[PDB]
Symmetry: D2
Subunit: 422 residues, 4 copies
């Protein structure tokens, strides 16, 4: 009890991980909520330590939205150093209700944890295949940054969702300052802000959940206040600077949206978050720098996150040169976690539409074209054209050989069309 608490307090005081982070609660409070034993969360712990290190040693970390394990595995094979788990993509195509939803927190709260677990389990299998074949060359255990939306209710829903993300092996979790019952994609209308004090309580709840689980999980504070021109309540005096006095039929207060409202929220959330994220209506370098300088005046060195959103028309907003240089340029402002939220959705839907249309028009000629493009990608590191090997048929054959002392008559890769034709 003494030792357990003293060790926790010692970690908060000495570890540079917690520099500039406020905890408005004690080590004794955390140990009181932990129960009588510590449960180890190996992937969550390893991932969060690796992510913390990468954010401070890489020029920046660029990720793509992944909604299956296989998408994540190809992202790691292409050389990306983190996976982004979009709640938008989970609403669309990968939630535990099995419905297609817009991005309005309509799906079950345990849906993103479930996909974190799936992704970690695919990466484990990929690691096992590689390890079994004699190398540890590729590091398949890359950090997953997951979308917790507005936490699917109040501060206790936030607490439970943060714990579920850690249980599943997420390295980082983002929370946004929206009223959960009205939650929207950052690039839709009808965004309703929480009071500053409530959004702060959600970030404190996420940190308390991480502390109870015993894992230094990365917390990303997102503000929707650049575009949001509604707030649930006028209760917080710091929000009254932006309130016009008009009320909607629902009782929401209208506000003066813009960079001033977002900077105010960023500065409020910075002491309670590892990274700050400002949603924007277009990919604008000047706005990104303005936001960055505002945070950096009060919290120099504060890590920032940037949504390179497919909700933008990139060629409409930016010239070819500006597009090519965009990520390197914003990284120089402190945007060290950068992610294309819906890359997985667009990859999956475009790929299948074009394939199925080709197939409809030209039958097996369209499918052979795809198989040939796959053979052509092998020299750049693609391996999935050998699908039996990719999903672990070789790993399970070796399991069977260890079980039977190498006598099994029913191993799968020997006598396969893969070994004959590939």
């Amino acid at each position: 009890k003494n030792e357990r608490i003293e060790k926790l307090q010692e970690s908060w005081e000495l570890d540079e991980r917690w520099e500039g982070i406020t905890r408005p609660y004690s080590a004794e409070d955390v140990i009181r909520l932990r129960g009588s034993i510590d449960i180890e969360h190996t992937l969550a712990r390893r991932g969060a330590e690796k992510l913390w290190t990468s954010l401070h040693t890489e020029d920046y970390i660029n990720a793509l939205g992944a909604l299956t394990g296989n998408q994540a595995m190809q992202q790691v094979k292409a050389g990306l150093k983190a996976i982004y788990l979009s709640g938008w993509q989970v609403a669309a195509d990968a939630n535990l209700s099995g419905h297609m939803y817009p991005d309005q927190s309509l799906y079950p709260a345990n849906s993103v944890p479930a996909v974190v677990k799936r992704i970690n389990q695919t990466l484990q299998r990929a690691d096992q295949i590689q390890h079994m074949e004699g190398s540890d060359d590729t590091d398949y255990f890359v950090p997953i940054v997951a979308d917790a939306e507005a936490g699917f209710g109040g501060q206790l829903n936030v607490f439970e969702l943060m714990k579920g993300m850690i249980e599943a092996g997420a390295s980082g979790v983002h929370f946004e300052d929206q009223l959960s019952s009205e939650k929207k994609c950052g690039h839709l209308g009808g965004k309703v802000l929480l009071p500053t004090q409530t959004a702060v309580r959600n970030l404190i709840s996420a940190r308390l959940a991480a502390d109870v689980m015993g894992v230094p999980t990365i917390i990303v504070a997102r503000t929707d206040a650049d575009a949001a021109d509604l707030i649930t309540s006028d209760i917080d005096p710091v929000d009254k600077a932006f309130i016009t006095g008009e009320r909607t039929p629902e009782g929401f207060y209208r506000t003066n949206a813009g960079l001033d409202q977002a900077i105010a929220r960023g500065l409020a959330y910075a002491p309670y978050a590892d990274l700050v994220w400002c949603e924007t209506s277009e990919p604008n370098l000047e706005d990104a720098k303005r936001f960055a300088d505002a945070i950096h005046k009060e919290h120099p060195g504060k890590l920032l996150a940037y949504n390179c959103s497919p909700s933008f028309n990139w060629k409409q907003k930016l010239d070819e040169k500006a597009i090519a240089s965009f990520q390197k340029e914003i990284a120089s402002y402190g945007y060290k976690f950068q992610f294309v939220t819906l890359a997985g959705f667009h990859s999956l839907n475009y790929g299948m539409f074009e394939l199925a249309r080709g197939y409809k028009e030209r039958g097996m000629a369209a499918y052979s074209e795809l198989q040939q493009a796959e053979f052509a990608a092998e020299k750049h590191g693609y391996s999935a054209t050998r699908h039996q090997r990719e999903v672990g048929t070789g790993y399970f054959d070796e399991v069977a050989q260890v079980i039977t002392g190498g006598t099994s008559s029913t191993t799968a890769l020997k006598g396969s069309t893969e070994e004959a034709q590939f």
Copy 2:
């Protein structure tokens, strides 16, 4: 009497059941049904639609889908059926959340869960189109789903078939492999059931469809073309293929090939709506020999063909043969043709290429995909407008109906989608 007679009339009077053996009575089926009939709308409409299409179209060709979005794009592309691969579910979409090879390792309710997801995505697509003021596209295309070797015995088959129907499947395939040693048709190590056991599984499948009251399509698959092992020598009709050699596990070695496959194909034909012979390559003359063998006994019998990504197509066939393949086997009676792993290869190839591009060139790579999407809108692609695609418009209308048009928090007005697209 009323329920018995009604069922009996269907079996005897309907064209649907021409050439189909049921070894049990209508009275057997109503004894197992319970006191009420539960309707299965998507299962019934899909099975009716599939049966009609298989008789009106030259052929029906499908691709594997492992998500509702993949299925939705297949429909928008103009395909008339969806294939639900168990291989794909093993690989990336099963209820254990693990990546597995194709050896019946995932939980048995996994394929039904994906059937239900695809039907719910199609339902949403239909809801969006209907709200916007058209019923142009028929989103309710039939799903043909993989039941593997039934994940156990005759009772596991019965339960799985019911699960497929509950989820809204139009058709279901079962193969003549030992469930505990199940393999992908193009993997080694395959073990056949005795003919009599494989026939009992098909009986079990039909009895499940009959209990649920739905005319579900049943595809009987044989793995006897390459499978050189059988569990048992119990069945006298299997004797001709059994060598007498046994494996250490006690499986009996058989002489595999087209003769063993034709024998099972003829045994299964009275108990299924389509017969499917797994092959080791896309060989027109073998396809023709199998078809002629079946049709010799059962003229007009519908057949199914796996246009498998487990074949190296360029290596096996010239451009001309690849171009004509589906229309050529359709002329032998292969009216249901499917690329089992199309969803896997589309998803994996697509993401690898985007991710490598992104790794090398950041947003130039993403912008290239976005520009390709915009161009693809000129031949019917819509997913560029991602907010509309997923039903943001549908939920805006629901909100406006609930609030009588007073809602201050609708999504599409003020979106970047409306301003930039």
Copy 3:
């Protein structure tokens, strides 16, 4: 076409089912949201119809909370005419997170539909076992009335949850006028009311879901306003009579709680629900009568529901004569749906504690006492002592027999210890 619209509009205006019910939307609105086909929901339709007839047949329907199919199956065998599906019980022991939770909407939103479906599936198996053996006497297809709490967010979460309840085969669903993010058990402190207008919109959302599904599901409007002394907002002029002007640190408004507040909400909800339910702090005939009289002054004949809560200390509140007559009496005021919310939780916990303690002290003598109690109950309609039969071993023996033309070697009941010893 335009007929399919006119028919729906006619049924609302003319069918007895919809007497006294307001729909602020049109038939054309519902058909616009239904898509191109109608999907059949047999158990949800039949059970809603049977629940409506039952409410006009019996003096009252008294139900117990069930958290498993087997509990619901025994409730039917004991002669009860509906099943109550408690969200409290799902929180505690039967939700899709697998956690034990207090009753604060912490669990995933699809959890109660999952349990509705489980209970319907057990009841289907019971009916199959009876049907196969040649009886159709017991009606196993009793209506389920399910807890949708405060809808797990906004009006769209309400819409989706109500659709989930109908897909699962619920006959009725209840919704309460609480802020979802602060949801509590009716007998906990810290309850926050919605504005009257928001609570009404939630009821409108639930009816629109049931109309879109094409099922006449029973909707129960619950008010928490008897004890709730907080409201989210003063936006609704009809709530201003109860609002003191004091505010909490979170920005909630203090209200004067009591029967007057509860009556105001009951009158406001009555046109938008089939039954009205007033949560109470104790089982008091006079208060039950005042509430029913107040409703019936404006809505003569309105069906009411009453929670016979295990959260009450019954012996502390009522003498034994008053306990024995309670349901008979409040039924005469119009409380035609009565339920013990946590019956299942208390039955399962108490029975296992008693069995485990006896077993700890006396080994198999304690287990043999239960088994002898079960044999003694068979005279009264209990059958589960023959566990193999109860769970449908005889049904599956008959499936195997039909499949094999009566040649199976591996049927279960012949050669069982059940066949030899029971």
Copy 4:
């Protein structure tokens, strides 16, 4: 990598945990299958260690079947030292297909691990409540012994199910020598044996999964050979003594069932299992002695498990005196793990039938009778009377107060009927 191999061969050579246990594979093979990292499984490891220690320090460990976390929690509160997780109970009322099934391996293979996980999470919450209130008196983390049936297919299905059990935090797992596609309850007809070699390969597969996961999980080897008079294959020479030559229409071989066939299987499985279990058709002391004496001839001090089955009519088979001493008496033969498989089913079904029938006849008088019985049980350590506390309402109140720095106006136990009336 040398260190990972070294720590494994050091454990196998030095630790008496592995006395008498044969592993046909190498520490090298285990590390080649594990992958590049070690994942910690705290509850599986602590549970298996606790279970191993209990089986050596106590005369016996007696358990009851539990199918919910609440049942398991009351078993612990009553003073039981292990929890039995019955596959039969999961088939009946707690599997992931949500159907009521006989005990024939019809449900999804991940169902029992899902219930292991639920029970551990319930025990964790009870630990958290006790810890917060300021003691660690009760050890809630009692070991769970879980039913893996016949492994839901071949040796790879066994391998996956064992890993699933360990991931969920099971302390022990049982596997039976039945053909999975024909699996029956031990007390049903139509059981079919695997050949000895195949049964042994399943046990090898289980041990390899535990070694790969890095946890010393208890493996129980069950034989159905006392009553099973069918086998799938005559392939194994050690089985020819029992095979008659008679076959069934399905191709199964008739065998001479009885204690000789069971002793043969028990001796064959002993080197591959930590406990051996012989299914019996009645609770017969002489048969239990004869089995123990035949195993101990070759494996002195081998731990044995005994099913105190509700499939037996206990009063038909034994006198009052014999029932009362039965567990003590078979414990002296080496039956150190004793469990009543279906205690959860009979407790749940009997209790709810009795309550619903009393509720049917006497309304709230019947419910008040249960509530007063519950109050009477408090002196013995029953706490569920106070249901709000039991499920962690006070835990989540203290979480809310920590997040809000003590400023929350919405905590749940303050103003509850539980604080007012109990």
